[PDB]
């Protein structure tokens, strides 16, 4: 995994450590973060670790995802063009990455659009009270099932093309309201069967939420099994 410092050219700054777009061995575009899990986990929908410089000032090198975060993507020029089949297909890739995390007995803890990265041809990869399950926020009970909750929130980000969840509510009010059984209602033009899936992710009992294997399968099959008569509307 170790590479020499001179094999990395840092080209454009992408964020603040810091995140750059660069070159690896004068051949390969890569993303670069500046001054053990990513070595074990390997999957087509998880952002891939390429290399490390493991003595301060430390450098982590991964595959470059040309579109930045899914939040930026949904809120940019492309948002107006995405429709439900594009958003459902992205949701299905994320579930797929999360199905892997599930299978490896890992927990993400901060699943939401800002932590999904997007590439060419809409490849999406896995890389906060409004996104956090009640039992995680209240009791520190983070599990694969609290990720499932967050994934339901992320479904609403996809279907609103990036709007903040619970419009108008502050954090305390979200937590107070969600404890009373409040759930976001169907987004405009979003089919009820898709909002029903959200509502499954948001079940009070963590054990009653579906697996990511289930979510992935459901979303892959969406347009044949669940909405065979779907027609594109003005926004979805």
């Amino acid at each position: 995994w170790e590479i020499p410092r001179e094999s990395l050219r840092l080209e454009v700054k992408l964020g603040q450590g810091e995140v750059w777009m660069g070159t690896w061995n004068g051949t390969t575009r890569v993303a670069i973060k500046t001054l053990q899990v990513m070595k074990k986990l390997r999957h087509e929908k998880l952002v891939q670790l390429y290399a490390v410089v493991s003595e301060e000032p430390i450098y982590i090198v991964t595959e470059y995802m040309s579109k930045g975060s899914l939040l930026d993507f949904l809120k940019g020029e492309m948002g107006k063009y995405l429709r439900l089949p594009q958003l459902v297909d992205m949701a299905a890739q994320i579930a797929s990455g999360m199905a892997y995390v599930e299978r490896m007995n890992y927990v993400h803890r901060d699943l939401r659009a800002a932590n999904i990265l997007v590439g060419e041809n809409l490849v999406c990869k896995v890389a906060p009270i409004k996104w956090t399950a009640p039992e995680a926020a209240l009791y520190g009970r983070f599990t694969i099932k609290s990720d499932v909750w967050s994934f339901g929130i992320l479904l609403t980000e996809l279907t609103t093309k990036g709007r903040v969840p619970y419009p108008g509510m502050v954090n305390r009010e979200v937590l107070d309201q969600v404890e009373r059984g409040y759930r976001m209602p169907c987004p405009p033009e979003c089919p009820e069967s898709l909002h029903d899936l959200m509502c499954q992710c948001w079940r009070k009992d963590p054990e009653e939420r579906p697996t990511f294997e289930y979510l992935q399968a459901f979303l892959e099959d969406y347009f044949t099994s669940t909405e065979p008569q779907y027609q594109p509307g003005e926004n979805l």
Side-chain angles (χ1 to χ4, degrees), residues 1-8 10-26 28-32 34 38 41-43 45-53 57-104 106-108 110-191 193-204 206 208-212 214-228 230-233 235-236:
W1 290 111
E2 284 279 338
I3 64 166
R5 288 171 184 280
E6 64 274 7
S7 55
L8 288 179
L10 281 80
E11 270 135 16
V12 173
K13 185 162 160 174
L14 291 185
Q16 285 222 319
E18 306 155 51
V19 198
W20 289 70
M21 192 209 304
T23 294
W24 183 28
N25 300 144
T28 312
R29 211 169 302 179
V30 289
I32 313 171
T34 63
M38 274 175 162
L41 300 165
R42 193 186 304 288
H43 192 272
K45 308 305 176 170
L46 254 60
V47 189
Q48 185 58 231
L49 182 72
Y50 287 171
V52 191
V53 175
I58 31 88
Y59 287 76
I60 311 209
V61 185
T62 60
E63 57 180 306
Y64 176 65
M65 304 290 293
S66 70
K67 307 309 173 187
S69 66
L70 175 60
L71 186 61
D72 294 333
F73 190 61
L74 291 165
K75 283 159 76 54
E77 179 198 315
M78 282 295 298
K80 75 187 266 201
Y81 297 107
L82 302 171
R83 285 305 176 278
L84 208 68
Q86 302 73 225
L87 309 164
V88 164
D89 154 20
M90 306 188 255
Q93 299 178 252
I94 295 153
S96 195
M98 288 309 296
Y100 177 77
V101 170
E102 189 167 75
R103 279 191 313 270
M104 310 292 289
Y106 286 89
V107 179
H108 183 114
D110 187 27
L111 189 66
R112 42 171 164 122
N115 292 329
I116 306 306
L117 286 173
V118 173
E120 297 284 296
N121 200 21
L122 295 181
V123 179
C124 291
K125 290 178 184 194
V126 177
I129 278 322
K130 288 177 182 216
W131 288 261
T132 302
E135 76 277 1
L138 285 160
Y139 301 118
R141 259 263 290 304
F142 286 89
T143 71
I144 195 66
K145 299 307 188 169
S146 47
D147 288 332
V148 160
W149 177 291
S150 298
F151 179 80
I153 303 301
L154 166 48
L155 285 182
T156 83
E157 292 184 277
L158 279 167
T159 52
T160 58
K161 289 151 180 215
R163 295 313 308 267
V164 173
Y166 310 92
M169 310 184 228
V170 309
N171 281 353
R172 196 94 255 171
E173 183 198 341
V174 168
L175 176 77
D176 284 10
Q177 277 293 304
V178 169
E179 270 305 75
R180 294 198 164 239
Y182 180 86
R183 295 300 187 269
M184 277 174 291
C186 193
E189 296 181 51
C190 167
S193 64
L194 195 54
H195 180 244
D196 177 80
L197 187 81
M198 294 172 200
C199 282
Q200 289 164 56
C201 293
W202 302 330
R203 300 202 261 242
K204 162 151 230 66
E208 304 290 328
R209 296 160 202 163
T211 67
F212 279 104
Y214 181 93
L215 291 156
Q216 182 188 347
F218 173 99
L219 295 155
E220 300 178 328
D221 288 3
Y222 197 78
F223 300 92
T224 293
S225 289
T226 310
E227 304 294 327
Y230 160 86
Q231 282 299 142
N235 300 254
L236 292 176

